[PDB]
Write a protein that binds this ligand. Structure first.
Ligand SMILES: *[C@@H]1O[C@H](CO)[C@@H](O[C@@H]2O[C@H](CO)[C@@H](O)[C@H](O)[C@H]2NC(C)=O)[C@H](O)[C@H]1NC(C)=O
Ligand SMILES: *[C@@H]1O[C@H](CO)[C@@H](O[C@@H]2O[C@H](CO)[C@@H](O)[C@H](O)[C@H]2NC(C)=O)[C@H](O)[C@H]1NC(C)=O
Ligand code: 7RC
Ligand code: NAG
Lengths: 374, 217, 77, 228, 49, 49
């Protein structure tokens, strides 16, 4: 890497805006990217805070560049030193988080009922069937009785030899009623589980308890030396957050987004005008929360620059009457890309049951044929 | 401790001066924030004297060791921090308005997953069940009378009950011209009733987290 | 404070004013707050519910006993 | 596979297509006539399939209960530049969208989108007393200043969404403090306002004066099964 | 039939009475309306607060 | 009264008090009596009754 003024080519929203401004007021521009990637902040060096203006802001203030056309946020610190034109885009800080895929649960079909409950019904069928056979044989078979009790519970038509005695008939009807209650209870329990089984709620703004109570399991940061850092330092209520973000603060607005995609990060706080574009272009991220530092961008200029009046008018007239929609819908809006469904968690348990029965059935037939042989 | 290059304590902190009979430390927290606000409002200059002679306060053979010990005598006229109020401490010192509440409380783990009670299988009101039974008897009597007009004696009651439950129950169906219409109308009522019953249980199964509510020691 | 210290009154009023506007509200939330402060979670009740299971089976046993009693009554004649 | 197994077992110890017929009936509601293949072990297979039918049907009905829980969906226009507004006579036209005439919003749209203003003038000389907000049941979209439109949306009984946000606003501008040309007060006021945005300003003030009952919400609605 | 039961379950589950105030931060209190009438005792600490 | 339910969280946490005139000499005696008797073995007896 030469690391020394390699000639590249730039293009986009701001560059398109710059070309329009030059045409309408006779510029002659020579774009020049910031030496060190950094938006700009007031750093303290040798007990002189104002001495250190890091980033592109220092370049404009020192004298290297007399115009700072870029996504530069408007806040108090910069406004005190440099002059900001009327905003060409209104935005505000917002949280970008990874979209959580809606996976299912209930890995087994028997989850709603505990192991004891299955046993109780299993022996309940046997005990009820045997008693029915005894009542029928009393005269006030076992195979027929077992078939009837099993069929009613499983809702199958294999039932044969309905009870004849009144005592048997009443017991059978109550047995069927118990079968309806058990099945209905199971479906109701499953519906409650499925309805209440949803992924964890998203952050939903800076007021979420997760952010207000930072934890090692949540890693949310921003871009180093930006307006986000200045906004949090000035406030006193947001005292815990700043210490957390200061630990994992990233180096660029592109590295942080990549970290969120890779799952290394968990929540990125940046300008909504940029995050909303990344979410739209990248179908993997979704921006949550509400803007909480509503501000605008600006073509900052030195305090004595005579361009302030005719840049500010040019932004208001051209950009925001017929132009803003043209540019925004071309570079920001043009680029565009449900409860979980049981897939193989319910089937796996049920299917293993069907296959398990088939092997047992093959064994039963061999045993049955062997018994019939003699 | 302060950072080697930090020197003075960073913002949101005060210079802690742990002293005994030298190193600089930064003390921060809830009560310290209270102390800073009190100094700003009242308008004095504080000087933290983080104690090391003991604990929050105790009496040893007529000697007070701790923050109360320093506040007692004349070594330091304040003990901002975590100091409870009782007769003994309030008898020799002079406390202030309690800015935080305390006491001998009880901590109990919450009972996760409250279980539906035994009577959770009845979403229908008692009058709901009684009315259904009376309608079934009336319908059964109507069916038998219609069949008699154009055998079945107790079969109608047996058949009537089977439809309300799961239909998988053998039963003889009374053949007729209009009695079948009555069976279908009852069958529709069974389908509507069973759907309502299952739907309600789904609403009943949605429980919450219940924590045992002691009477407070 | 020291017994009889004049600072009692100025501090007493100063603290009472803090309770009026912020104090615990602002300060306690910063320093004495946790993740689930209020917490209210709905739980899908597992159908183990031996109370629920017992109730259904209790009615079944009563019906089973009633069937036995009616069988004996019929068998009496 | 189960049907083939049942027929083979029955053949070992008639039914040809009945097994498939019987197998399908159990999975659905059992109220369907069918001949039950008698046997020693084939019945066990039927019961095991029957249990699978009960477990399957219970799962299917349980899921629909989760699917039927829908939300409130608001049409998401493109922000006054959507194909719906410009050149409306391309698809089923939206309900006539109008505004207060003889103002500033009307002038801007006419000077920038003459085609849209031609059709947009169906019903909208001057005034209209902004009653279209109350009459937003016969016309779909309302176009007017966003500063007041946000207020009326929040303050309204119940509430209705506004197809606007950070973007989707055509001529986004702000509210200023019109000082005299070249007045020295510009700088002190400029910095004073910029500091307000830092700590409170809109946050504290807008909540006091420009807030409504349902500022934000997402209400789950039990979807009626009309759902053509 | 399955669709009907599922729809009924969704209706019953989502059919609950209006949520209570739940503190002074509720939107209903923060945005007073003529349909809500909340008051206190005249000349008390509530008035001063 | 089984008809009303209190909602929300306390937002002006304070206490009661046996107020007295500024020059009253009972302040020290009364304050000690509250701390000693009331809130060591008595508060539960009175409050639970
Ligand atoms: C931009 O600023 C320049 C001055 O820097 C303006 O130029 C003046 O334009 C008026 C009207 O054409 C003339 O009467 C003056 O003589 C011009 N002065 C100079 C120094 O050129 C220009 O009009 C402004 N344009 C915009 C877009 O505001
Ligand atoms: C109640 O107040 C009286 C005086 O107002 C206190 O009596 C004093 O008690 C101490 C120690 O017992 C003696 O040294 C003083 O001489 C007493 N004063 C007088 C005027 O006799 C009494 O102690 C207080 N009791 C409580 C519980 O506060
Ligand atoms: O009031 C101050 O002295 C202290 C007193 N502490 C007593 C602790 C008794 P254990 O250690 O819990 O058995 C509680 C905190 N404040
Ligand atoms: C702006 O006006 C000057 C004077 O006519 C002209 O020389 C220049 O070419 C114009 N625009 C630019 C800078 O191209």
């Amino acid at each position: 890497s030469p690391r020394h003024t390699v000639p590249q080519c730039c293009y986009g929203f701001c560059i398109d805006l710059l070309i329009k401004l030059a045409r309408t007021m006779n510029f002659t521009y020579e774009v020049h990217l910031v030496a060190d990637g950094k938006f700009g902040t007031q750093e303290r060096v040798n007990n002189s805070n104002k001495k250190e203006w890091n980033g592109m802001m220092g370049e404009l203030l020192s004298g290297q560049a007399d115009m700072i056309v870029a996504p530069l946020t408007i806040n108090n610190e910069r406004a005190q030193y440099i002059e900001f034109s009327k905003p060409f885009k209104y935005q505000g800080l917002t949280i970008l988080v990874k979209k959580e895929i809606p996976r299912s649960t209930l890995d087994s079909f028997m989850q709603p009922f505990q192991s004891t409950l299955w046993l109780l019904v299993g022996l309940s069928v046997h005990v009820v069937a045997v008693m029915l056979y005894l009542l029928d044989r009393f005269s006030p078979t076992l195979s027929s009785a077992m078939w009837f009790s099993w069929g009613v519970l499983l809702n199958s038509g294999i039932g044969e030899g309905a009870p004849r005695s009144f005592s048997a008939r009443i017991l059978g009807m109550v047995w069927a009623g118990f079968a309806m209650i058990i099945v209905a209870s199971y479906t109701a329990n499953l519906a409650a589980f499925l309805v209440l089984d949803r992924p964890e709620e998203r952050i939903t703004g800076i007021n979420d308890p997760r952010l207000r109570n930072p934890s090692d399991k949540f890693i949310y940061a921003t871009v180093k030396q930006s307006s986000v850092d200045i906004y949090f330092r000035r406030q006193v209520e947001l005292s815990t957050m700043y210490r957390h973000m200061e630990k994992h603060n990233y180096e660029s607005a592109a590295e942080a987004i990549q970290a969120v995609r890779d799952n290394k990060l968990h929540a990125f706080i940046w300008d909504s005008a940029v995050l909303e574009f990344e979410a739209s272009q990248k179908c993997d991220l979704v921006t949550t929360g509400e803007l909480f530092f509503r501000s605008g961008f600006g073509i900052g200029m030195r305090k004595d620059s005579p361009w302030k009046q005719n840049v500010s008018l040019s932004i208001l007239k051209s950009h925001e009457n017929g132009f803003m929609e043209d540019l925004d819908k071309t570079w920001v809006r043009y680029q565009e890309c449900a409860p979980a469904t049981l897939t193989f968690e319910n089937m796996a348990g049920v299917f293993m049951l069907v296959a398990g029965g088939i092997v047992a059935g093959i064994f039963l037939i061999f045993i049955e044929i062997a018994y019939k042989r003699h | 401790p302060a950072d080697p290059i930090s020197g003075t304590c960073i913002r949101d902190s005060v210079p802690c001066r742990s002293q005994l009979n030298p190193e600089k430390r930064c003390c921060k927290g809830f009560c310290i924030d209270i102390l800073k606000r009190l100094a700003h409002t009242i308008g004095f200059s504080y000087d933290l004297y983080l104690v090391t002679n003991g604990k929050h306060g105790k009496k040893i053979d007529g000697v007070w060791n701790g923050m109360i010990g320093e506040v007692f005598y004349q070594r330091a006229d304040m003990a901002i921090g975590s100091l409870t109020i009782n007769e003994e401490r309030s008898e020799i010192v002079d406390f202030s308005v309690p800015f935080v509440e305390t006491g001998i409380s009880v901590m109990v783990a919450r009972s996760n997953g409250t279980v539906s009670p035994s009577a959770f299988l009845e979403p229908y009101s008692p009058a709901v069940w009684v009315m259904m039974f009376v309608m079934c008897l009336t319908v059964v009597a109507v069916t038998v009378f219609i069949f008699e007009y154009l055998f079945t004696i107790g079969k109608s009651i047996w058949l009537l009950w089977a439809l309300v439950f799961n239909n998988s129950v053998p039963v003889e169906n009374p053949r007729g011209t209009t009695s079948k219409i009555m069976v279908l109308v009852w069958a529709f009522f069974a389908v509507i009733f069973l759907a309502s019953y299952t739907a309600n249980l789904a609403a009943f199964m949605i429980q919450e987290e219940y924590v045992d509510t002691v009477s407070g020691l | 404070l020291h017994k009889g210290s004049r600072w009692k009154r100025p501090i007493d009023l100063a603290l009472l004013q803090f309770l009026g506007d912020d104090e615990i509200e602002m300060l306690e939330r910063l320093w004495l707050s946790g993740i689930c402060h209020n917490d209210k979670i709905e739980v899908m009740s597992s159908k183990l519910d031996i109370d629920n299971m017992a109730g259904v089976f209790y009615m079944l046993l009563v019906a089973m006993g009633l069937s036995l009693l009616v069988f004996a009554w019929e068998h009496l004649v | 596979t189960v049907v083939a197994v049942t027929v083979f077992i029955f053949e070992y110890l008639f039914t040809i297509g009945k097994s498939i017929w019987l197998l399908w009936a159990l999975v659905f509601n059992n109220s369907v006539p069918v001949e039950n293949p008698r046997g020693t072990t084939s019945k066990i297979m039927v019961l095991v399939w029957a249990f699978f039918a009960v477990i399957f049907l219970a799962s299917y009905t349980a899921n629909l209960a989760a699917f039927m829980i829908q939300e409130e969906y608001v049409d998401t226009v493109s922000g006054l530049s959507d194909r719906k507004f410009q050149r409306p006579q391309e698809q089923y036209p939206p309900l006539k969208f109008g505004t207060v005439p003889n103002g500033s919003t009307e002038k801007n749209i006419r000077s920038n989108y003459p085609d849209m203003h031609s059709y947009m003038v169906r019903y909208n000389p001057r005034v209209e007393e902004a009653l279209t907000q109350l009459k937003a049941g016969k016309l779909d979209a309302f176009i007017y200043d966003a500063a007041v439109l946000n207020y009326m949306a929040r303050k309204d009984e119940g509430c209705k969404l506004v197809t606007i946000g950070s973007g989707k606003v055509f001529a986004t501008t702000g509210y200023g403090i019109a000082l005299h040309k070249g007045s020295r007060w510009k700088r002190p006021i400029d910095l004073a306002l910029l500091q307000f945005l830092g700590d409170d300003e809109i946050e504290m003030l807008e909540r006091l004066w420009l807030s409504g009952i349902c500022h934000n919400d997402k209400i789950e609605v039990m979807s009626s099964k009309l759902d053509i």
